[PDB]
Amino acid sequence: IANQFNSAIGKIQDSLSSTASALGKLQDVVNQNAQALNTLVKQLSSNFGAISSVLNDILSRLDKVEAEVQIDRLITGRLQSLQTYVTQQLIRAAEIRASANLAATKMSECVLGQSKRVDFCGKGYHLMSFPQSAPHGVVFLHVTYVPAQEKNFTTAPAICHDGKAHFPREGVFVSNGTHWFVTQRNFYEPQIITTDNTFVSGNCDVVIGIVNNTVYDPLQPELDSFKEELDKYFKNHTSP
Amino acid sequence: VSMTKTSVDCTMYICGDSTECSNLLLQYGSFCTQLNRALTGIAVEQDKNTQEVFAQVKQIYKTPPIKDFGGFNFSQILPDPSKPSKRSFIEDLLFNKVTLAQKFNGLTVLPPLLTDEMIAQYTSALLAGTITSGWTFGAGAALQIPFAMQMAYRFNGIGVTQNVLYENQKLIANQFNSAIGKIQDSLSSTASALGKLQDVVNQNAQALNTLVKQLSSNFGAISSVLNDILSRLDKVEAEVQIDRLITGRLQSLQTYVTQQLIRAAEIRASANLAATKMSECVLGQSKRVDFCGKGYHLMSFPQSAPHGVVFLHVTYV
Amino acid sequence: TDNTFVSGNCDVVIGIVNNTVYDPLQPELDSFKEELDKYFKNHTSP
Amino acid sequence: SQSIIAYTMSLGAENSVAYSNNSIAIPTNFTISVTTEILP
Numbered sequence: 001i002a003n004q005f006n007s008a009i010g011k012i013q014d015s016l017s018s019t020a021s022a023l024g025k026l027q028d029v030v031n032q033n034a035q036a037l038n039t040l041v042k043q044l045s046s047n048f049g050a051i052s053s054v055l056n057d058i059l060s061r062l063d064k065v066e067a068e069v070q071i072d073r074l075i076t077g078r079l080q081s082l083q084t085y086v087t088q089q090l091i092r093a094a095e096i097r098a099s100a101n102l103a104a105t106k107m108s109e110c111v112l113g114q115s116k117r118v119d120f121c122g123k124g125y126h127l128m129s130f131p132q133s134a135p136h137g138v139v140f141l142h143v144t145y146v147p148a149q150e151k152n153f154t155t156a157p158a159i160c161h162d163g164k165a166h167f168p169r170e171g172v173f174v175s176n177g178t179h180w181f182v183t184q185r186n187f188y189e190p191q192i193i194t195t196d197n198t199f200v201s202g203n204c205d206v207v208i209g210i211v212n213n214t215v216y217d218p219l220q221p222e223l224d225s226f227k228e229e230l231d232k233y234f235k236n237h238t239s240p
Numbered sequence: 241v242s243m244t245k246t247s248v249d250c251t252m253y254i255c256g257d258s259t260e261c262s263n264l265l266l267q268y269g270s271f272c273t274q275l276n277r278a279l280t281g282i283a284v285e286q287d288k289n290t291q292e293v294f295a296q297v298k299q300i301y302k303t304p305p306i307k308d309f310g311g312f313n314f315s316q317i318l319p320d321p322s323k324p325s326k327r328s329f330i331e332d333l334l335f336n337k338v339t340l341a342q343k344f345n346g347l348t349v350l351p352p353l354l355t356d357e358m359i360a361q362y363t364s365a366l367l368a369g370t371i372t373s374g375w376t377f378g379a380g381a382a383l384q385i386p387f388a389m390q391m392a393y394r395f396n397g398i399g400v401t402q403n404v405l406y407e408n409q410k411l412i413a414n415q416f417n418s419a420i421g422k423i424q425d426s427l428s429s430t431a432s433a434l435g436k437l438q439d440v441v442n443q444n445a446q447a448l449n450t451l452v453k454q455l456s457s458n459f460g461a462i463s464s465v466l467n468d469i470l471s472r473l474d475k476v477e478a479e480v481q482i483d484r485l486i487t488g489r490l491q492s493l494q495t496y497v498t499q500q501l502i503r504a505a506e507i508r509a510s511a512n513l514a515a516t517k518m519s520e521c522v523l524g525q526s527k528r529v530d531f532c533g534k535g536y537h538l539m540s541f542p543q544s545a546p547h548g549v550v551f552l553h554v555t556y557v
Numbered sequence: 558t559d560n561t562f563v564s565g566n567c568d569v570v571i572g573i574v575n576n577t578v579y580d581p582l583q584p585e586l587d588s589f590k591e592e593l594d595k596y597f598k599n600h601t602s603p
Numbered sequence: 604s605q606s607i608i609a610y611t612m613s614l615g616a617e618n619s620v621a622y623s624n625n626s627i628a629i630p631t632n633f634t635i636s637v638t639t640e641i642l643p
């Protein structure tokens with residue numbers, strides 16, 4: 001488990017040290033921020049119908065009253081260029097806040113906890129996550145258990161014994177094709193079907209697909225060796 | 241989950257069939273490119289939203305040809321082969337209950353990347369994965385388990401002991417089959433059930449209708465028709481009237497792109513929620529109260545709808 | 558004693574009640590004390 | 604010998620799950636998977 005973790009963290013270094021594009025979600029934010037300021041500087045070069053885009057070319061060439069008709073065009077177009085930038089930034093800031101509220105929730109539930117939510121903290125069953133910082137963002141290394149090498153088994157919902165139906169306490173019943181075992185649901189590790197692995201309910205008539213197998217009671221051979229211990233004590237006592 | 245993708249020729253909306261208006265529109269610079277970058281940023285994420293909700297399955301899982309699910313009858317929600325698109329019976333109710341002159345104003349509607357057949361195939365794989373393998377296809381490879389033995393694991397998940405399934409399994413199967421029966425009857429009979437999806441289509445249509453109607457407005461010019469202004473006035477007076485139509489049209493576009501950007505953020509929040517209900521209710525079983533319907537969550541089945549998703553949430557009450 | 562666990566004494570829990578708690582090992586040994594006794598009563602005969 | 608091609612996208616590898624009323628698959632082993640998630 002440690003060698004698989006150390007090898008999996010090794011592949012995070014190899015991937016981040018190799019590919020140019022892994023942080024594309026963070027480079028998109030920088031690219032959108034930079035593009036909006038470069039677009040806003042480009043809207044200064046526009047005339048909006050004025051004789052020039054430059055106030056010094058209006059104020060050197062026109063008189064105080066013929067200038068104002070040109071200056072108000074540039075004011076009107078620029079003022080709309082700022083209201084466009086600030087509207088785009090207020091909408092874009094709500095995209096980043098929704099992502100910061102998610103990242104704060106992954107910090108609480110994936111790093112400060114162990115999550116039972118499916119696919120919230122990576123693709124698998126969540127063990128733990130490690131936070132790493134990045135430019136304008138966070139990176140979570142999510143560690144997950146992934147079950148790897150399955151076998152087919154025959155299975156039953158219950159075992160029938162003394163006409164009583166037995167169910168697993170934790171686990172599932174399985175058969176290799178000739179013997180019946182009880183095992184934990186998420187990893188094949190089989191045990192003999194004992195009275196400590198199972199619970200009784202009702203009779204074998206009500207469960208669809210119940211199978212006949214013995215259910216072992218671990219007290220019985222410790223009492224049965226007490227019955228051989230008793231019987232040899234009587235055989236010894238017959239002697240006098 | 242998504243809304244219609246649109247794009248606009250800003251020069252054809254403002255100045256359609258006018259070289260004079262096009263040569264005045266150059267005075268405003270970047271705005272017509274910046275409007276098209278906004279509508280593209282919306283259109284690119286409608287495909288993202290759809291793919292984040294539906295494409296959560298690694299492989300296209302198929303159901304067995306024998307339907308031995310312990311009495312649970314999924315035939316209303318599984319694919320129906322006798323169709324051009326393999327939608328389920330309930331999916332073909334959903335596609336009928338939402339009902340869906342702009343073009344020559346430079347406006348156009350773009351197709352989604354995933355067709356309704358591909359959304360139905362992903363939904364089939366999510367449903368066929370769920371009923372053959374439980375939650376295991378969400379966390380690894382799909383591992384088969386009998387459906388009544390999966391439903392016993394689900395009963396343990398709500399704190400109910402698994403003999404309460406196996407000793408009552410015919411009642412539980414009949415109550416599921418009777419509850420899926422009532423889903424069909426409700427969806428068939430009742431109009432307003434898909435109101436959430438019809439409202440998105442109605443808001444997109446009312447927005448494009450309003451955008452086209454703003455071409456008939458004068459904005460204080462002598463006409464709303466560029467040819468009237470250009471035939472009746474000389475160059476220097478026509479350029480004063482054409483600029484009123486450019487100013488008012490360009491604000492009519494900037495208003496549409498702003499309400500579309502604001503509305504795309506509501507649809508994204510709903511797609512992110514629908515993707516979370518797909519992961520947590522379909523690929524799992526949820527302890528989160530009232531998240532996967534009212535009651536104690538057992539399981540959920542996805543069904544596709546026009547521009548959305550339907551979850552049939554199954555609960556112990 | 559299989560459905561339940563024990564901790565402390567009756568003096569601390571507000572609203573504790575009195576009922577018997579069955580020990581499933583008790584008749585499993587008492588039916589073995591009759592298996593002792595009937596084998597002893599037989600061995601009185603020789 | 605290179606060109607641009609155009610094709611209908613695949614949705615993933617296709618799979619019939621081996622379901623039966625009495626068959627279960629149980630994993631005999633596991634892997635530890637570390638996966639990176641990036642958030643603005």
Ligand SMILES: *[C@@H]1O[C@H](CO)[C@@H](O[C@@H]2O[C@H](CO)[C@@H](O[C@H]3O[C@H](CO)[C@@H](O)[C@H](O)[C@@H]3O)[C@H](O)[C@H]2NC(C)=O)[C@H](O)[C@H]1NC(C)=O
Pocket residue numbers: 176177178179
């Ligand atoms: C199903 O699982 C069974 C348990 O693993 C298995 O039966 C076991 O088979 C082994 C031999 O492969 C036996 O091992 C013993 O063999 C002799 C017995 O005299 C001893 O000398 C050895 O030391 C060793 O203990 C087990 O006794 C036997 N167990 C039982 C409960 O019968 C089946 O073979 C498996 N079947 C399939 C199809 O996989």
Ligand SMILES: *[C@@H]1O[C@H](CO)[C@@H](O[C@@H]2O[C@H](CO)[C@@H](O[C@H]3O[C@H](CO)[C@@H](O)[C@H](O)[C@@H]3O)[C@H](O)[C@H]2NC(C)=O)[C@H](O)[C@H]1NC(C)=O
Pocket residue numbers: 160163212
């Ligand atoms: C699982 O174990 C059960 C208990 O041994 C077993 O039930 C028993 O099955 C036999 C054979 O079918 C029955 O035999 C008698 O059947 C009728 C009377 O019920 C007579 O007409 C016949 O002559 C014959 O004597 C047992 O009566 C029956 N016992 C009970 C308590 O039901 C199941 O058949 C076993 N199942 C499997 C698949 O192995």
Ligand SMILES: *[C@@H]1O[C@H](CO)[C@@H](O[C@@H]2O[C@H](CO)[C@@H](O[C@H]3O[C@H](CO)[C@@H](O)[C@H](O)[C@@H]3O)[C@H](O)[C@H]2NC(C)=O)[C@H](O)[C@H]1NC(C)=O
Pocket residue numbers: 574575
């Ligand atoms: C639950 O069962 C308890 C065990 O039977 C019982 O405790 C017993 O309570 C009575 C009455 O309080 C005591 O009776 C004695 O009271 C005093 C001494 O404390 C004497 O002067 C009396 O003559 C009488 O003998 C028992 O001694 C006491 N036994 C023990 C072991 O504490 C509880 O009262 C029962 N509780 C309820 C709610 O029923």
Ligand SMILES: *[C@@H]1O[C@H](CO[C@@H]2O[C@@H](C)[C@@H](O)[C@@H](O)[C@@H]2O)[C@@H](O[C@@H]2O[C@H](CO)[C@@H](O)[C@H](O)[C@H]2NC(C)=O)[C@H](O)[C@H]1NC(C)=O
Pocket residue numbers: 150151152619620621628
């Ligand atoms: C689990 O079993 C399935 C199919 O059932 C088995 O069929 C026999 C081969 C035998 O194993 C019986 O005991 C079972 O009843 C396997 O699925 C088949 O896989 C092969 C490739 O290995 C493929 O060519 C077949 O088309 C599949 N058939 C079906 C019906 O699905 C599956 O591989 C087994 N899985 C494991 C993990 O062992």
Ligand SMILES: *[C@@H]1O[C@H](CO)[C@@H](O[C@@H]2O[C@H](CO)[C@@H](O)[C@H](O)[C@H]2NC(C)=O)[C@H](O)[C@H]1NC(C)=O
Pocket residue numbers: 313315316
């Ligand atoms: C699963 O439920 C459907 C009904 O929703 C059953 O299909 C009907 O079966 C009857 C009897 O053969 C036919 O007359 C109807 O025409 C069927 N309706 C449809 C929509 O196909 C189906 O038989 C049930 N499955 C099982 C195994 O009982």
Ligand SMILES: *[C@@H]1O[C@H](CO)[C@@H](O[C@@H]2O[C@H](CO)[C@@H](O)[C@H](O)[C@H]2NC(C)=O)[C@H](O)[C@H]1NC(C)=O
Pocket residue numbers: 411414415
């Ligand atoms: C538990 O509730 C169910 C219904 O939710 C009961 O099942 C119904 O029982 C009556 C007769 O008692 C029948 O007429 C109905 O057809 C049954 N419905 C179904 C879906 O099978 C059931 O009897 C109740 N059980 C207990 C122990 O109270």
Ligand SMILES: *[C@@H]1O[C@H](CO)[C@@H](O[C@@H]2O[C@H](CO)[C@@H](O)[C@H](O)[C@H]2NC(C)=O)[C@H](O)[C@H]1NC(C)=O
Pocket residue numbers: 003004149631632633634
């Ligand atoms: C469980 O899987 C691991 C690998 O994920 C197996 O470990 C490898 O075993 C082979 C020999 O069988 C070695 O060559 C490798 O070097 C091992 N890798 C590691 C990381 O140690 C392991 O053997 C499997 N266990 C079982 C019971 O199947």
Ligand SMILES: *[C@@H]1O[C@H](CO)[C@@H](O)[C@H](O)[C@H]1NC(C)=O
Pocket residue numbers: 208209210308624625
């Ligand atoms: C399982 O299906 C087979 C037919 O393939 C049938 O003979 C058997 O009785 C069924 N068993 C259960 C538990 O339903």
Ligand SMILES: *[C@@H]1O[C@H](CO)[C@@H](O)[C@H](O)[C@H]1NC(C)=O
Pocket residue numbers: 236
């Ligand atoms: C008989 O049992 C007694 C113990 O009761 C022991 O001391 C003695 O060695 C035993 N002898 C034989 C022959 O079993």
Ligand SMILES: *[C@@H]1O[C@H](CO)[C@@H](O)[C@H](O)[C@H]1NC(C)=O
Pocket residue numbers: 571572573
């Ligand atoms: C419960 O309330 C009654 C009064 O209705 C009181 O006599 C009794 O002692 C209370 N018991 C507990 C366990 O609080």
Ligand SMILES: *[C@@H]1O[C@H](CO)[C@@H](O)[C@H](O)[C@H]1NC(C)=O
Pocket residue numbers: 595599600
């Ligand atoms: C008494 O013990 C003898 C062996 O010493 C045995 O043969 C006989 O069946 C027993 N009788 C009873 C009533 O247990």
